[PDB]
Design a protein around this ligand. Structure first.
Ligand SMILES: CCCCC[C@H](O)/C=C\[C@H]1[C@H](O)CC(=O)[C@@H]1C/C=C\CCCC(=O)O
Length: 1195
């Protein structure tokens, strides 16, 4: 073994305690674990081996299906492969569950001793120790050995999953090209990423499909043997919870779908804000989106709030049920005339505790998980029944060939085809430009096949698609493509590709690994790599698809005019291209049009405590937690006092030699049931209300921060990084954290229930509990540091599996052309192994903790039992039965509590990642107390003085000392290097970061007012316009202040009305996604409407028309020039002609005012930088500009 596996040498005891799969924790306590540390798989779990195993039975099922003339069944195939193995775990399942029923009987007899307690005996005490001894062994079944068994069940699922991953990838490479049309990777990805992941989740439960009924029956048997048919009153309620719990499933599932539409609506809108934040902020449209997001959140939260409450009732059912079904039983047992006797009640109580899980939870889940599995199995079977490529398989000859792309109504892609080519030759193909006719190679490749026609091929085929592609590994590993590194040929061809000269620039060093998904290489350079493979593959047949002509350079001359044009003329090659300057040298050409071979011939034919403190206080007022803690505790007190009351009653019965006062004892007893269910539902609802209300707070406060956040904040943070929070980190605080949190609280008290009962009945048990405490803390400490890191290793190593699948499925035609079946299989098997090593650890490591934990839970029951016998002088008869009835329950819940502790402590990180945003830096307020007058912009005056600006605090200065006046009604253009010229001036004038120096507007110092007070009074048209998914009205006036005739006027100021007035909503036309239905220029026309409505006296225009239809551009100019003659207008130039009409130009190059003058005077100075920038025109058009400038000064 490359990585020796301790199961190979752990003794037969070792796997009971996981004693020896141990050193990995030694390492994990000191170090971050790493991908070599994880042990290799057991040899029998390897992806190839499980593949070959299961493929055999599936083939035999295909044989059965043919011979029996029926559909094959994949479930039958997997069964006959696994069943003779899988049965053995059944026997444990039987013996395990039988003991869960029998502990009650010996528990009875232990209690039975206390009913006939005599001090002057040792034999019954010895008899009791015997029962107490067997009660211990029963616990070691469930508490220790169970953790061996449960692992191997996990492995049957893990084994089954890996086999299916193998057979799937095998089937995919064999998949017909036609089926690929009927398929998409996303199906195979849903299949292999998720739908096959169902196969772990099934095997844990599969035996409950039958073990449940047996268990339930047996409980009814012992119950019939115990309390007679009075138990039928109780069991009926236990059954009713199965349909009822099923009922909740539909309702909350509905409400889940009821909410899904709004999280998308919020998150899709949220996406526009983070995408548009630059343009949003400059328009001062924060308020519009603020209203929307709030009200969608109000619409959304109302559903999730009601849903949580109709889930909160569900949790209290899992808490209080046992107190209901106990209550209806013994009430019946009294009224039908029995006394209550401690043994019989605590026997009955414990049996209900045992059956409850099997019927209330496990069997319900069991039928569910198989139901999800079986549908997945059917579609995988269907996928395994898709058609396959026919694996039947120096020169190529074709004659009379007439096949379609597919036998169909398509016009046949090839007709009249015959040709012959012999070693030493290049064929070519010519047809429509960029046309799919190169699919001819797929017929030569055998990817297509003759409907009728003769085809002959001998020797290997290289293929390159016009699509670039990369396998996994290094570029060299991609180039090697499973062939040996032939240094001499590698050097010769990498030189022939000129590729080493470029590889220093692309991989930055020869032996460098291709980054994720091929990220390192330019696609055009990656296009070279496929050809680099082909030339590296030294092939006998070269089938070349139409190359990326942008590569046409001396690199391509080395590739084409030497390597292809002379060397790879060895044996055969075919090059479909319109590179007729290379194909004029072609030996023969096949010419295709409308599917005809119209002619053929040679070319001459042509987490810290601060998290919890902030998270809870953001809920309801902090005093409410004190009231909440009374509900949490009071419920627990009602739950425990019920069974204590049930015990106390039996004791009073034992004094009787006459009746107990039924209607006092039973009256009170029923009181506690009413008490315990009521507080139970009361608790459950309250906790959700506090936390889901907390989600409401943290959302609003946090969302406020995004809008007040300065634009610099988005220049650092990637778009995804923020939107993920609104999508999924707040996602946790709605769907899942409150529920997971309540369950934890609901259990933690239950563990305190058992413990406090035990120590209150048997006071001296408090002593060993402290050792038990500190061990637990250290173990949780030692484990969780290790386990958290294993979780990361699993989460990482999974993604290559479908990533390899995805690129491989993209790579199909290449991979199959080279017949690289085993190399790709070896690779997919490899990843599945590395993932299997992580999944192997996750299973065993999670388990190790569980057994080294439930050992103490077993230690706990044992101390209660023997402690009870030790103290027998002191113990009251019923009170033994109480403490034992509780203790035997702990063997369940103790593991589940600590599972949830890690899950909440992990998920509480989503609270921290949201608090992070709630106090980011803010711009200066949107409004100041100092306020601009309504008449303010009526001067239209801009002052620049000493203006120094940086795109970030302390960053490079890109405005330097800039001091200038822009006067009323002036029209001035600004130009230079893009990063010196545009975003610098945009941001500083709009206070997107506070400029140094000073800017004044109409003798108002621009720092002195609120930012909406500023930004409302100016308009921007950016280079990239944006339209927001919503009405044309909202894209024009989200404040509804401008009437549709005004809006239509704008729509009639532009030409757009005659292109939108047809739309069904008119002004209320709900746009397509970002209005992609509208032309880019049309989006630009919309911004002008925003200006036309805004009517600002000051207008800043970015270089919008950099890529606009000239007549559309000149239309833009007309309305700009017309309507804003009185306005003061800044324009940034993509090209000088766009601004040559300006009264003046400011030249901002290197961040300095290189020029500020009349452009003609600038051109009158043959030394001016503007003249030099005009000299870059290289054309007499400078004169047309020159006159056009001069025309301004005619009068
Ligand atoms: C009252 C507390 C129980 C609430 C329901 C509980 O989650 C359901 C089943 C629990 C039960 O408490 C005993 C037990 O071990 C079950 C664990 C659940 C799944 C198996 C994996 C356990 C693992 O490896 O973590």
């Amino acid at each position: 073994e490359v990585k020796p596996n301790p199961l190979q040498d752990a003794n037969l005891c070792s796997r009971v305690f996981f004693w020896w799969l141990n050193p990995l924790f030694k390492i994990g306590h000191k170090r971050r674990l790493e991908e070599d540390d994880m042990y290799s798989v057991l040899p029998e779990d390897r992806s190839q081996h499980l593949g070959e195993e299961l493929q055999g039975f599936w083939d035999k099922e295909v044989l059965r299906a043919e011979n029996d003339a029926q559909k094959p069944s994949l479930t039958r195939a997997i069964i006959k492969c696994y069943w003779k193995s899988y049965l053995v775990l059944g026997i444990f399942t039987l013996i395990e569950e039988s003991a869960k029923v029998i502990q009650p009987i010996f528990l009875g007899k232990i209690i039975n001793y206390f009913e006939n307690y005599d001090p002057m005996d040792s034999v019954a005490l010895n008899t009791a120790y015997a029962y107490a001894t067997v009660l211990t062994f029963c616990t070691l079944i469930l508490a220790i050995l169970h953790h061996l068994y449960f692992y191997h069940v996990q492995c049957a699922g893990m084994r089954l999953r890996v086999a299916m991953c193998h057979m799937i990838y095998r089937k995919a490479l064999r998949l017909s090209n036609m089926a690929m049309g009927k398929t998409t990777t996303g199906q195979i990805v849903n299949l292999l990423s998720n739908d096959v992941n169902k196969f772990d989740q099934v095997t844990v439960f599969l035996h409950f499909l039958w073990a449940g009924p047996l268990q339930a029956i047996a409980v009814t048997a012992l119950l019939w043997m115990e309390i007679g048919i009075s138990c039928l009153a109780g069991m009926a309620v236990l059954i009713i919870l199965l349909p009822l719990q099923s009922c909740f499933g539909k309702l909350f599932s509905s409400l889940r779908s009821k909410t899904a539409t709004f999280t998308d609506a919020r998150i899709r809108t949220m996406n526009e804000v983070i995408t548009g934040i630059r343009i949003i902020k400059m328009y001062a449209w924060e308020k519009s989106f603020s209203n929307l997001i709030t009200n969608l959140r109000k619409k959304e939260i109302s559903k999730i709030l009601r849903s949580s409450c109709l889930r909160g009732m569900n949790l209290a059912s899992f808490f209080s049920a046992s107190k209901i079904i106990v209550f209806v039983t013994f009430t019946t047992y009294v009224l039908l005339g029995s006394v209550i006797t401690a043994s019989r009640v605590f026997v009955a109580v414990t049996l209900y505790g045992a059956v409850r899980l099997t019927v209330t939870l496990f069997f319900p889940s069991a039928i569910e998980r198989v139901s999800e599995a079986i549908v997945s199995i059917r579609r995988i079977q269907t996928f395994l029944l898709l058609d396959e490529i026919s694996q039947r398989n120096k020169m190529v000859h074709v004659q009379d060939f007439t096949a379609f792309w597919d036998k169909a109504s398509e016009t046949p892609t090839l007709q009249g085809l015959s040709f012959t080519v012999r070693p030493g030759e290049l064929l070519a193909v010519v047809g429509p430009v960029g046309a799919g006719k190169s699919s001819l190679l797929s017929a030569v490749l055998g990817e297509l096949a003759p409907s009728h026609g003769l085809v002959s091929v001998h020797g290997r085929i290289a293929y390159v698609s016009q699509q670039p592609w990369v396998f996994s590994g290094t570029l060299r590993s991609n180039i090697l493509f499973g062939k040996k590194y032939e240094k001499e040929r590698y050097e010769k061809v990498i030189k022939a590709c000129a590729l080493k000269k470029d590889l220093q620039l692309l991989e930055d060093g020869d032996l460098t690994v291709i980054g994720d998904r091929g990220t390192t290489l330019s696609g055009g350079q990656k296009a070279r790599v496929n050809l680099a493979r082909a030339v590296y593959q030294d092939a006998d047949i070269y089938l070349l698809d139409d190359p990326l002509s942008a590569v046409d350079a001396e690199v391509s001359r080395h590739l084409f005019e030497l390597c292809i044009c002379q060397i790879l003329h060895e044996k055969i090659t075919i090059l479909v291209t319109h590179q007729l300057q290379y194909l004029k040298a072609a030996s023969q050409i096949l010419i295709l049009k409308d599917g005809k071979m119209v002619q053929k011939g040679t070319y001459t034919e042509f987490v810290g405590f601060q998290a919890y403190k902030n998270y809870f206080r953001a809920g309801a007022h902090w005093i409410v937690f004190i009231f909440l803690i009374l509900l949490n505790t009071a419920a627990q007190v009602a739950y425990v006092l019920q069974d204590w009351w049930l015990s106390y009653w039996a004791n009073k019965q034992s004094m009787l030699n006459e009746k107990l006062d039924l209607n006092w004892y039973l009256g009170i007893y029923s009181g506690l049931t009413v008490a315990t269910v009521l507080f139970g539902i009361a608790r459950s609802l309250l906790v959700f209300y506090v936390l889901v209300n907390s989600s409401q707070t943290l959302h609003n406060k946090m969302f406020e921060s995004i809008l007040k956040a300065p634009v610099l904040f988005f220049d650092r943070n990637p778009i995804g990084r923020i939107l993920n929070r609104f999508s999924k980190d707040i996602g946790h605080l709605d769907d899942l954290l409150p529920l997971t949190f309540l369950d934890f609280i609901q259990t933690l008290l239950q563990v305190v229930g058992v413990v406090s009962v035990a120590v209150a009945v048997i006071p001296w048990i408090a002593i060993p509990l402290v050792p038990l405490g500190i061990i637990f803390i250290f173990l949780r400490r030692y484990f969780l540091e290790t386990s958290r890191d294993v979780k990361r290793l699993e989460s990482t190593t999974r993604s290559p599996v479908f990533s390899h699948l995805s690129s491989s499925l993209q790579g199909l035609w290449t991979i199959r052309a080279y017949k690289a079946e085993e190399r790709c299989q070896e690779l997919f098997d490899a990843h599945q192994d590395l993932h299997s090593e992580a999944w192997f650890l996750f299973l065993t490591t999670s388990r190790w903790f569980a057994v080294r934990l439930d050992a103490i839970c077993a230690m706990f029951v044992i101390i209660v039992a023997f402690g009870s016998l030790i103290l027998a002088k002191t113990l009251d008869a019923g009170q033994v039965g109480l403490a034992l009835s509780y203790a035997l329950t702990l063997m369940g819940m103790f593991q589940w509590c600590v599972r949830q502790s890690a899950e909440v402590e992990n998920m509480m990180i989503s609270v921290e990642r949201v608090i992070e945003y709630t106090d980011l830096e803010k711009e200066a307020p949107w409004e100041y107390q100092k306020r601009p007058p309504p008449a303010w912009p009526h001067e239209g005056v801009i002052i620049f003085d000493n203006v120094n600006f940086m795109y970030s605090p302390g960053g490079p200065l890109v405005l330097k000392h800039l001091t200038a006046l822009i006067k009323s009604q002036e029209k001035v253009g600004i130009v230079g290097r893009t990063g010196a010229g545009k975003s610098s001036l945009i941001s500083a004038l709009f206070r997107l970061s506070e400029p140094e120096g000073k800017i004044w507007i109409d003798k108002i110092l621009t720092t002195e007012i609120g930012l909406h007070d500023l930004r409302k009074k100016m308009s921007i048209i950016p280079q990239e316009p944006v339209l927001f998914t919503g009405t044309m009205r909202k894209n024009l006036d989200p404040f509804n202040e401008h009437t549709d005739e005004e809006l239509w006027n704008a729509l009639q100021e532009v030409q757009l009305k005659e292109t939108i007035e047809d739309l069904p909503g008119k002004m209320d036309t709900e746009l397509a996604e970002s209005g992609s239905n509208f032309s880019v220029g049309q989006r630009q026309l919309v911004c002008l409407a925003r200006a036309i409505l805004r009517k600002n006296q000051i207008l800043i225009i970015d270089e919008a028309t950099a890529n606009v239809d000239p007549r559309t551009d000149e239309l833009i100019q007309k309305k700009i020039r017309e309507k804003f003659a009185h306005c003061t207008v800044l324009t940034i130039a993509h090209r000088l002609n766009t601004i040559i009409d300006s009264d003046k130009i400011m030249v901002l190059d290197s961040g300095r005012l290189k020029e500020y003058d009349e452009p003609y005077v600038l051109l009158q100075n043959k030394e001016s930088l503007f003249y030099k920038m005009v000299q870059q025109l290289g054309k007499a058009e400078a004169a047309a500009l020159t006159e056009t400038a001069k025309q301004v000064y005619f009068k």
